[PDB]
Amino acid sequence: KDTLIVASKVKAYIKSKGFMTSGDAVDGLNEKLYALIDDALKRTESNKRTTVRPTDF
Amino acid sequence: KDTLIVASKVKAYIKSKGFMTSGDAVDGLNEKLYALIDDALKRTESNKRTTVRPTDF
Amino acid sequence: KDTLIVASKVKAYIKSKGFMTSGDAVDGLNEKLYALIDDALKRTESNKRTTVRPTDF
Amino acid sequence: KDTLIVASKVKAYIKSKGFMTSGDAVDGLNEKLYALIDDALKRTESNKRTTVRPTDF
DNA sequence: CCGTTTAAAGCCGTT
DNA sequence: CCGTTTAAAGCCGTT
DNA sequence: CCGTTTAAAGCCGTT
DNA sequence: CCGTTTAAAGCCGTT
DNA sequence: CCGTTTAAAGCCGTT
DNA sequence: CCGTTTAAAGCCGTT
DNA sequence: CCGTTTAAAGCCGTT
DNA sequence: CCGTTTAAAGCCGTT
């Protein structure tokens, strides 16, 4: 639902590597980010934890 | 280098799924995000493109 | 459906790094592999291609 | 080093989805698979475990 | 297939 | 408890 | 065609 | 917001 | 140009 | 292994 | 910033 | 021990 990334920051970085960002690239990256977090929450739970660690991503 | 994600938004979502976020979780997620983008830029280039599309992620 | 990985080869490698493999680890890795390929096929198609390249993974 | 996937099985599946496999696609998929396992071994260790579980992938 | 044994899970008081 | 792996069982042609 | 970005428009307190 | 312009898409004959 | 796949070549015991 | 053929790459004018 | 408190880590005997 | 979050402190224009 909510945007979790800083579009301007992402475009800044992509530009710095000699590339451009499509109108719908950020929405797509945001979908991948949710998938990462949802994957991480399943790893947290399978380790009997309530606290997500960097290693769970 | 730069933070690309909204820590507060990430913690909000993780909380809503009945979990907590570690002090260093967001920095870890930020590393994964860079890896996603760096992977995507290699896909853009291998398709002879300068414009990153959502599909490249 | 079909197993795409060499269980014995995977266990060999995991052992060589000083770790063991759970009874259901390989089935789980096989699920991740399918997800990688299904992701790659969507990248192939979005580039108007029928031939999957290493870069699509 | 070692091939961990069944090239013929992978090509079989990719064919069944209406696509072809490049000469160097399988080597590329094999690299991604190693990256998955190396990622999984770091998750195993950070949970103070020696036994890789499906959830670690 | 099975025995050996290493490793994970369980319990509880501490951080 | 469970994964690893050594060892036993099975099959068949020889002694 | 489309993404980037420069430039114009909008708002308000000053000249 | 909009103009500029770079880049992607389209078409077709070759590899 | 390249990937797919059909077809030819190789090996050996039979006719 | 090799022939067939589908698909990707190349070129250029348009969007 | 800080206090509250939930959760993770530690220890050891069991599976 | 640590993450969450409530509460206190800081800044400034008013009473």
Residue numbers in the entry:
A (entry chain A), B (entry chain A), C (entry chain A), D (entry chain A): 7 to 63
Question: Would you copy out the relevant sentences from the publication that reported this structure?
Answer:
Histones are conserved DNA-packaging proteins found across all domains of life. Here, we describe HLp from Leptospira perolatii and show by crystallographic and biophysical analyses that, unlike HBb, it forms stable tetramers and binds DNA nonspecifically, wrapping ~60 bp of DNA around its core. The HLp monomer exhibits the characteristic histone fold, comprising three α-helices (α1, α2, and α3) connected by two loops (l1 and l2). Molecular dynamics simulations, DNA-binding assays, and heterologous expression in Escherichia coli, where HLp reorganizes the nucleoid, support a role in bacterial chromatin organization.
To gain structural insight into the interaction between HLp and DNA, we co-crystallized HLp and the 30-bp-GC40 fragment. Diffraction data were collected for two different crystal forms, HLp-DNA_1 and HLp-DNA_2, processed to resolutions of 2.10 Å and 1.90 Å, respectively. Both structures were solved by molecular replacement using the DNA-free HLp structure as the search model. In HLp-DNA_2, the ASU comprises a single HLp monomer, which forms tetramers via crystallographic symmetry, and a 15-nt ssDNA segment of the apparently endless DNA. Although the overall crystal packing is similar to HLp-DNA_1, it exhibits a complementary DNA binding mode, with the dsDNA engaged along the HLp tetramerization interface. Therein, in both HLp dimers, the monomers bind to DNA via two sets of interactions. The first corresponds to the “β-bridge” motif in eukaryotic histones and involves T27 and G29 in loop l1, as well as T56 and T57 in loop l2, while the second set involves K17 and K21 from helix α1. The two DNA-bound crystal structures thereby reveal complementary, but overlapping DNA-binding interfaces distributed along the orbicular surface of the HLp tetramer, corresponding to the canonical interaction motifs of archaeal and eukaryotic histones. Crystal structures of HLp-DNA complexes reveal the HLp tetramer to be decorated with distinct DNA-binding interfaces along its perimeter, including motifs corresponding to the canonical “paired end of helices” and “β-bridge” motifs. While the two individual DNA-bound crystal structures might hint at a DNA-bridging mode, their structural superposition and the location of the individual DNA-binding motifs suggested a potential DNA-wrapping mode for HLp.
